[PDB]
Chains A and B, each alone.
With several copies, the nearest count.
Chain A
Amino acid sequence: RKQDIIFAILKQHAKSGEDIFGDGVLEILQDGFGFLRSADSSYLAGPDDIYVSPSQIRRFNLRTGDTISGKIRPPKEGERYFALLKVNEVNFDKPENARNKILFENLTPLHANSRLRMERGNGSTEDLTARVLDLASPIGRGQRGLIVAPPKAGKTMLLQNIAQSIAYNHPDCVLMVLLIDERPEEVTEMQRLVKGEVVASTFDEPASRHVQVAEMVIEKAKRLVEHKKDVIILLDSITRLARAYNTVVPASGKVLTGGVDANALHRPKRFFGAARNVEEGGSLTIIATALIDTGSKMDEVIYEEFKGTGNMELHLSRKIAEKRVFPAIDYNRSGTRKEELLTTQEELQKMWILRKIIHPMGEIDAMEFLINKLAMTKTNDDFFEMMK
């Protein structure tokens, strides 16, 4: 109802002669034209979307994901969308700065160089999760990891803790938590808890909207990276997204074990590998949560295929989660490749000694030891100094 009221108000205001302003993310269709979707509707096709002529797209070399803000006009007799007259701001910047840009496909990838420390530093009991995460698997800019965990392991609490630690330590980073095929109540809870942008697509609509929202989000992330921004995407839907792609892919006659199409894992693997660290400027970090032991062999095949792709695995133990010990992290199975590029020599040596001491002990025993050692102090520096 609000959209029709705004439409009528804008019409009455344009009848007087005043200017009308709009904003939205561009979604170029296959025919050549596009529309400016809205953020409050999770990039959903609305009746009051702003039409974008192909002439302006050719003039400014606009692509899917470009945030466009400019003057619009109400539709005339025979039109159903707002025509874009003049664009004022492109991607929160002037068009003269966006015209001389380098495409995302030409950026040179690199390994994680900058250290994104997750430790809060306030000495809270909730900071233990971030401390264990930093001790087990340090995360840097451009990291491409996977949160491997069975159902009912603590993915929600761990994701909330990660989001809060990111918003606390690194408020300059653009945090985007894209939740696909999840409960609406959980979406509402997350949106009113984390300090950032929350786009979601619940199961109430088919997988086409899921794929469309995923494409819009990845295009916006690529454009922001092109504009020298540090984008961090926490997509806890990678398994759901792979299921959606396998459901919407045309049959090719080559079905793998478990009901997986031969060309179904192409789009999600490309979405995952899109994350990379750019040397010219900016980075893209994608932390996804994979589902295992869900009773379906399709998810097992998806996990086994995506295991050889990322460079960071955070395994969670079902036993430790059932014992109500959070975070229930499998320290032995966790780790990060090329960790010497994110940690110093002494920090790497301390982590190596801690792993050599923890490995002989059992999972529950190692977790109890780590908790008892971290409870004695507030910062990990005192723990490191006492271990020696």
Chain B
Amino acid sequence: PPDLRPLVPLDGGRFATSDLNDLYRRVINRNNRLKRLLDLAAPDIIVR
């Protein structure tokens, strides 16, 4: 849940994002990339 992994509210536009949110973002990116690549029928090496 987002309250258990919130963004630290600090002054300025930047944000020291939590490591868990960064990991979730990376996993979502790497999953969406494979989801959009599997429909294109890419070569087996790239899929692997």
List residues of A whose CB falls within 8 A of some B CB: 32, 53-55, 58
Tell me if B36 is interfacial: C-beta within 8 Å of chain A.
yes
Residues in B neighbouring A32, C-beta threshold 8 A = 36
Residue of B36, B39, B40, B41 contacting most chain A CB atoms (<10 Å): B39
Q: Mark B4-43, 1 if CB is under 8 A from A, else 0.
A: 0000000000000000000000000000000010011100
Task: Give the distance in Å from the alpha carbon of A275 to the alpha carbon of B41 in the complex.
Answer: 40
Task: Give the distance in Å from the alpha carbon of A53 to the alpha carbon of B40 in the complex.
Answer: 10
Chain B residue, CB-CB nearest to A53: B39
A58 touches B36 (CB 8 A): no
Q: A54-B40, A55-B40 are in contact. List 7 more A-B contacts (CB 8 A).
A: A32-B36, A53-B39, A54-B36, A54-B39, A55-B39, A55-B41, A58-B40
Chain A residue, CB-CB nearest to B39: A55
Residues in B neighbouring A58, C-beta threshold 8 A = 40
Q: List 9 A-B contacts (CB under 8 A).
A: A32-B36, A53-B39, A54-B36, A54-B39, A54-B40, A55-B39, A55-B40, A55-B41, A58-B40
Chain A residue, CB-CB nearest to B38: A55
Chain B residue, CB-CB nearest to A57: B39
Residues in A neighbouring B40, C-beta threshold 8 A = 54-55, 58
Nearest CB of chain A from residue B38's CB, rounded to whole Å: 9
Task: Give the distance in Å from the alpha carbon of A55 to the alpha carbon of B40 in the complex.
Answer: 6
Residues in A neighbouring B36, C-beta threshold 8 A = 32, 54
Task: Give the distance in Å from the alpha carbon of A79 to the alpha carbon of B40 in the complex.
Answer: 20
Task: Give the distance in Å from the alpha carbon of A236 to the alpha carbon of B41 in the complex.
Answer: 47
Residues in B neighbouring A54, C-beta threshold 8 A = 36, 39-40
Task: Give the distance in Å from the alpha carbon of A32 to the alpha carbon of B36 in the complex.
Answer: 9
Nearest CB of chain B from residue A234's CB, rounded to whole Å: 40
Nearest CB of chain A from residue B29's CB, rounded to whole Å: 14
Chain B residue, CB-CB nearest to A58: B40
Chain B residue, CB-CB nearest to A56: B39
For the complex of A and B, list the 8 residue pairs with the smallest distance between their C-beta atoms, beginning with the closest: A55-B39, A54-B39, A53-B39, A32-B36, A55-B40, A54-B36, A58-B40, A55-B41
Residues in A neighbouring B39, C-beta threshold 8 A = 53-55
Task: Give the distance in Å from the alpha carbon of A54 to the alpha carbon of B35 in the complex.
Answer: 11
Task: Give the distance in Å from the alpha carbon of A55 to the alpha carbon of B41 in the complex.
Answer: 9
Nearest CB of chain B from residue A87's CB, rounded to whole Å: 16
Residues in A neighbouring B41, C-beta threshold 8 A = 55
Chain A residue, CB-CB nearest to B41: A55
Task: Give the distance in Å from the alpha carbon of A34 to the alpha carbon of B13 in the complex.
Answer: 31
